[PDB]
Design a protein around this ligand. Structure first.
Ligand SMILES: CCCCCCCCOCCOCCOCCOCCO
Ligand SMILES: CCCCCCCCOCCOCCOCCOCCO
Ligand SMILES: CCCCCCCCOCCOCCOCCOCCO
Ligand SMILES: CCCCCCCCCCCC[N+](C)(C)[O-]
Ligand SMILES: CCCCCCCCCCCC[N+](C)(C)[O-]
Ligand SMILES: CCCCCCCCCCCC[N+](C)(C)[O-]
Ligand SMILES: CCCCCCCCCCCC[N+](C)(C)[O-]
Ligand SMILES: CCCCCCCCCCCC[N+](C)(C)[O-]
Ligand SMILES: CCCCCCCCCCCC[N+](C)(C)[O-]
Ligand SMILES: CCCCCCCCCCCC[N+](C)(C)[O-]
Ligand SMILES: CCCCCCCCCCCC[N+](C)(C)[O-]
Ligand SMILES: CCCCCCCCCCCC[N+](C)(C)[O-]
Ligand SMILES: CCCCCCCCCCCC[N+](C)(C)[O-]
Lengths: 320, 320, 320
């Protein structure tokens, strides 16, 4: 719930004797304004979740989600835009859950500490693929008392090469190889009983990229505060450092949040944002919002386009 | 309903006190014959409608529709043909309904006066984008007594330009601009009590394009008559003028219709069609039909291909 | 059931008085290992089946199925991969069922004699388009006692040619023609009473391609054996010949299969496979499996890549 931009659970269309199917997703209208110029960023999601009990401590699972968009640019055009965001199957029970296929890595729940806005935020906490969301990957999650644990491992992708090792078509190949894109990620979160305090940390590595994250949060009644720190290498000796702060509170159905994000890549500031929004929940599956991002990049460095502020206006319906 | 080619409403997959989800669409097999040569024009549609009541005079809505086709050309090929026809969210109530995202403009309900065939017709009533269906657009509709009103406004699309004003990548851009494709549309329909007589009119404008339409219809017992006139400019001094006539009758099940369509572009005849069909309704969601279009373009002007007649045969199943 | 890799029936989401809609499909995680190198071959399917009774011996039908995949190659990429596998509508009753749109030809049920593995097999029984699955085709099937009959006919696809006879765009064309890809297929299967013996055979022809198939099987309690032979022409005078053997055994919740596959194209061996697998059914709609294919091609001929063994590991959830 606090991660406002994230998916909500869908609803049952059939069920019987331990086995069910839920359909979910959203229709979200989004208008973006930059320098008084408008862009349509609306999006639809559809998803399907199947779950089958094997016994009282064992079950199977299957999941798909797709995203659909348009880009007319002034004509009634044909729009062939599709993104298969999740494709996996898995097994779970007392020991937790394990899946294969495109699914989330371990660091998402860490970045969730400060990723609480409806449209903006989450600009200074980059995640590498194995830590984020990618296929050819085994993914695990589990909960033991007040400790939550996630982990993932990704295989390098098979390819085909000629005698010298250049990537080529499979018909013209001398042998199989791989792209060296194997990797792993790991994260842990401890909840201190009640009192509202959470702490979390994580690490990830893939090819010549690596990173770690530290985070903490306090939640009390209608108030919330959190902080997050990210540090690693994107390649070479290229350093990345990110800071995020977030605060939010609720008044009736209205939720209000603000974040500060600051990122540094190769010893220059690549992101510097203060953003604010307001979201009104008419119903659990119907909401409206408005958001503004103050861009603090220079404009002598960087440039005019990349230093522009942004206004966003949204209307979101959820299927469930 | 009289507009036979249009969508029918889908059916509920879950509900729970003012909130529902409906799934709909069609599987429509269509064979096209020209000069004794056959083409498969079959199509599938799937759509999802969510609706949530906020109160006795207020609700929210979200909608998506996609269309799916194949084009094998003699091989068992992979077919990645998708069209996202609708993507919008909106709010409605006592005063009517307003939406944002790709949805219909105002002139469709006007062209519906003569658009009554299962396959042919609707060839001499061109609609510009704001009047037809397009994104980055606010759309409104309402009904008050015997008066129906529709309206829409579309924003110009943001783009990025270099110092010289050339459209370029955002990374290579000196500033933001737009494509000048803003516009609007408006239409009204009046019903003369219970007399079966209807009149309608509309207007639309976008960049160097504009148009207006006038229409009238009469319905009595098992008979229907209608006329439609379209006039405007597609650009420069490129004039467009369109005339359509339609008549139909019903006998038990199976419906019979005929239309005449005639269009003139740049002071030359660009469309000239007389068409007849028969459609048999086995069930409300299962029908068959057959249609023939007499092409009356010359062949000395125009050409042999563009002056050919067409036979069409269809079988349509609707999901509900 | 015996054709393990094939679809299972979906489940009802709504129904009323003879008319229903079923949603089905799968989420299937699949890991492929060749030369110690891993490839993600996971896939999702979604399908929608509508059926409406007209009377005690007459009904209508509409069907769609799509397949969805990812190919990240180490990045969190956008994946626009869709395949519309089926798009058809049809009518059926006492005499059987007839459809138009992309659907199956007649020879699939013949290749089903030995196509019983979860992942491998079915490598030496090539089917031409009209016999396989393709659009612009009328398809018929029926069952009368122990006789199953299937047939199909496909039209050539309309195209457009210039004065010189070259395929060109419709605006630049002198006339309509076609690609000469018309054809037909035919097949039959008899069950020899309650003896466990089945015999089947089929034939197909399209443009300059043709083929026939012969098959037989014996099924008794928890044992199964079958054989299949394929012979025809792929073009001009270039020959194709295929041989398949299959065996299977069942123990409680557990299936075990093995197949031998051998094909010859243009008087050279193009396929040579011995494969074995094991599949465990936790629930009717949740299973796991592991499979190994011994590749028997030479390696001096053909090459190293095309002669590699393969290990496969799978986890399959079915939507119903
Ligand atoms: C995200 C804003 C920070 C407020 C955190 C306080 C703890 C409650 O957060 C739950 C997520 O809020 C969902 C908003 O839904 C509004 C429903 O109001 C019910 C409680 O007033
Ligand atoms: C439907 C094409 C126009 C034919 C004239 C119809 C005007 C007469 O009023 C009948 C109105 O019903 C229109 C519905 O048509 C759909 C077919 O439904 C037949 C099932 O009974
Ligand atoms: C499927 C190939 C395995 C060879 C043994 C089958 C011979 C006996 O047939 C018995 C009927 O079962 C056929 C369907 O099996 C599908 C999986 O069912 C497992 C759930 O009980
Ligand atoms: C999977 C290895 C488990 C290591 C976790 C050790 C438990 C105490 C540390 C968890 C709390 C998070 N933090 C930030 C304090 O490290
Ligand atoms: C006391 C200042 C609180 C700053 C954080 C508030 C979050 C942003 C709220 C959006 C603007 C609405 N407002 C002004 C009522 O807070
Ligand atoms: C709590 C937010 C902390 C953000 C402060 C981090 C400052 C980054 C310093 C980099 C300055 C850029 N440079 C290269 C000119 O030094
Ligand atoms: C929690 C502190 C956040 C403060 C937000 C202040 C926004 C700064 C905008 C600058 C414009 C103000 N002014 C007066 C210069 O126009
Ligand atoms: C009174 C007949 C004059 C035509 C009426 C207009 C409807 C034409 C429908 C075409 C159907 C062909 N049919 C069966 C009527 O001959
Ligand atoms: C029932 C409506 C009939 C509309 C037909 C209009 C005919 C105009 C086309 C004539 C040829 C154009 N022009 C002006 C060059 O002669
Ligand atoms: C009430 C009759 C309307 C239903 C029309 C159904 C037509 C079936 C198609 C038959 C094809 C005949 N044809 C075109 C080959 O001559
Ligand atoms: C043209 C030959 C007629 C078809 C042969 C009929 C098959 C024999 C009938 C066996 C009946 C079996 N069963 C289970 C379907 O009832
Ligand atoms: C023909 C299928 C395999 C069993 C062979 C039995 C021979 C009977 C052939 C006559 C029936 C032909 N058929 C089924 C197309 O009607
Ligand atoms: C008792 C015979 C059972 C044969 C089936 C064995 C399947 C191999 C195990 C694959 C499952 C891998 N994993 C971890 C995803 O479950």
């Amino acid at each position: 719930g606090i991660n406002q931009s994230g998916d909500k659970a869908g609803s049952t269309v059939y069920s019987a004797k331990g086995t069910s199917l839920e359909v979910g997703g959203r229709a979200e209208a989004r208008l973006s304004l930059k320098d008084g110029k408008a862009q349509d960023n609306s999006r639809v999601r559809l998803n399907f979740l199947g779950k089958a009990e094997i016994n009282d401590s064992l079950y199977g699972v299957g999941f798909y989600e797709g995203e659909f968009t348009t880009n007319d640019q002034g004509k009634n055009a044909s729009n062939n835009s599709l993104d298969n965001r999740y494709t996996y199957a898995g097994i779970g029970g007392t020991y937790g859950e394990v899946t294969y296929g495109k699914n989330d890595g371990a660091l998402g729940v860490i970045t969730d500490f400060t990723d609480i806005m409806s449209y903006h935020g989450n600009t200074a906490a980059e995640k590498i693929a194995v830590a984020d969301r990618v296929d050819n990957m085994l993914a695990y999650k589990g909960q033991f008392g007040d400790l939550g644990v996630k982990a993932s491992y990704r295989f390098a992708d098979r390819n085909a090469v000629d005698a010298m090792g250049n990537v080529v078509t499979e018909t013209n190949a001398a042998k199989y190889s791989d792209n060296g894109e194997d990797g792993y990620s790991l994260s842990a979160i401890y909840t201190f009983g009640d009192t509202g305090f959470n702490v979390g940390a994580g690490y990830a590595d893939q090819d010549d990229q690596n990173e770690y994250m530290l985070a903490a949060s306090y939640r009390m009644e209608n108030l919330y505060f959190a902080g997050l720190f990210t540090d690693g290498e994107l390649a070479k000796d290229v350093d990345y450092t990110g800071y995020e702060l977030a605060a939010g509170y609720k008044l009736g159905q209205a939720a209000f949040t603000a974040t500060y994000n600051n990122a540094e890549t190769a010893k220059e500031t690549s992101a510097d944002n203060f953003a604010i929004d307001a979201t009104y929940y008419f119903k659990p599956n119907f909401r409206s919002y408005i958001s503004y991002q103050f861009n603090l990049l220079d404009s002598d460095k960087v440039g005019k386009v990349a230093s522009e502020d942004e206004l966003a206006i949204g209307l979101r319906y959820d299927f469930h």
